[PDB]
Symmetry: C2
Subunit: 311 residues, 2 copies
């Protein structure tokens, strides 16, 4: 409590109020903050939402720290969030940045739950006046698609070498990308290496059909460590925002995303009621085991689960 004061404080720009709200996001504490979000929904959405991914070691934290510091220096308020699978189990300079709000990936039993708390945290930050939301993720199962469905622009960071030199990435990320940035383009030979690799990705991306006629994903080279190409990278993100806002496509994407998250939440309530209940959790596991083990057909397993939903 009390939720009327918290809201007025949040909308004013109060960091402790944002912190408090985020903390709430206990079942009755969860629910209180959801009514708050519905109430400030009209003051959300005035932010550029960017998803960022890439292989461990590519330079995500380094690049985020460098870009976020450029952005705060230019007068933005930057929220840096995360969707990390490891949360179900240091960007040093941005931390000291009072105009940045870093939040580690929230704890939750499922990746759906991690995704759900992050989307909540994002709307809270927007209501609090943050105008850039960066969402960091790693390529684990479904997290990349989840983050691409949470943001306006999905940035994929790549090591400076394609084809035979690729490792540790899921193929589909090239289709989620609104831009590929090849990192480690350090003065000298790094520039040549990264540029060679960018030219290959550029040639390859030509076979993938862009989802919008309004935007053809660029391939750029950057050095997050040495601060090369970062302003040009951001300029492309701003270009995308401008062009797709003009056609109504940012709004359009956001609406689709919202209805997707609505249905995903319904299925999430359902599942964790079946998995939480000391009454039916074992029966649910037994049905999944019978199906996965080929003892009973998928439909037979669904039949057993139906009875548990009865009760």
């Amino acid at each position: 409590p009390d939720m009327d004061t918290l809201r007025e404080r949040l909308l004013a720009g109060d960091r402790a109020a944002l912190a408090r709200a985020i903390t709430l996001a206990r079942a009755d504490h969860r629910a209180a903050v959801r009514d708050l979000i519905d109430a400030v929904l009209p003051q959300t959405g005035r932010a550029i939402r960017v998803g960022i991914t890439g292989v461990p070691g590519v330079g995500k934290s380094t690049t985020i720290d460098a870009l976020g510091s450029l952005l705060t220096a230019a007068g933005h308020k930057v929220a840096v969030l995360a969707v990390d699978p490891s949360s179900t189990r240091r960007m040093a300079r941005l931390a000291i940045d009072r105009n940045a709000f870093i939040r580690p990936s929230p704890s939750s039993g499922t990746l759906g739950g991690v995704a759900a708390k992050t989307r909540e945290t994002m709307l809270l930050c927007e209501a609090a006046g943050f105008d850039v939301i960066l969402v960091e993720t790693v390529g684990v199962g479904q997290s990349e698609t989840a983050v691409a469905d949470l943001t306006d622009f999905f940035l994929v960071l790549m090591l400076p070498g394609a084809g035979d030199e690729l490792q540790g990435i899921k193929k589909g990320i090239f289709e989620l990308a609104d831009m590929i940035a090849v990192n480690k383009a350090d003065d000298g030979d790094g520039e040549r290496r990264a540029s060679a690799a960018a030219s290959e990705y550029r040639a390859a991306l030509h076979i993938l059909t862009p989802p919008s006629a309004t935007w053809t994903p660029p391939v750029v080279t950057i050095s997050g460590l040495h601060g090369k190409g970062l302003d040009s990278l951001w300029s492309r993100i701003e270009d995308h925002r401008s062009k797709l806002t003009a056609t109504g496509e940012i709004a359009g994407k956001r609406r689709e995303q919202d209805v997707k998250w609505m249905w995903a939440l319904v299925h999430e309530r359902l599942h964790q009621r079946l998995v939480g209940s000391a009454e039916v959790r074992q029966a649910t596991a037994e049905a999944e085991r019978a199906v996965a083990g080929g003892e009973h057909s998928p439909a037979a397993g669904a039949d057993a689960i139906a009875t548990l939903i009865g009760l």
Copy 2:
């Protein structure tokens, strides 16, 4: 209902009439009929799974019906029994001429359900019945408009994408989401002469891009091939590549592993379809569900508030 023990025998004996009967019973409006079929399937489960399951997709007009008709006919001539199953999202609302007359083929349209998940899950059950009846090749095709590509990929062992022969400025391009699903790209309409030169030119562009974009050392590297479904070119080679995939991924256990993941997916799909039935069961709940979706879609209420409203209705 008929005697289900006789029906089971006839099905396992490979009787095509029994298969169609079991399918008709699955499509019945009576729940008690649909239940009998579910029990039959559980009973014949140990006799299922000895088939190559292939998903096939491509844009309308690429020549999918023609290619399936041709390939299906080669396979039945080679001693196989072939089922062709469609998956179409318009099954949730509201022509292969030679194979249609082939006694060793079994063709069925997309089953009705409330959700695409439901349609696909009912397709998996149909696939099990076909396999129990001795069908050793199951072709599952996407039909109409819709994004049923993922559903068809998650129903099968191998996902084949058919593409148009355009090259250079006329290259078709791979649609978003298909690149990560494709186990092979076949450029169709490689007719003798100009057509096959365009198809080979397109294949070379796809092959070069795929090399750049595909991390090495996967068990299987998706090939790019050219075919003509209409003139019967490249189909035996295309099939040998699918048999190669089966061998390689059977040896690593990857085919069994994927089928396990899929089966659990389809179980949960059926659970969700049943809860969707609840939300569209009467005019009043249908309208309430629509109003929740419209509120979230219009920015008036948050996703969580819409989800609250839905959960309540059930």
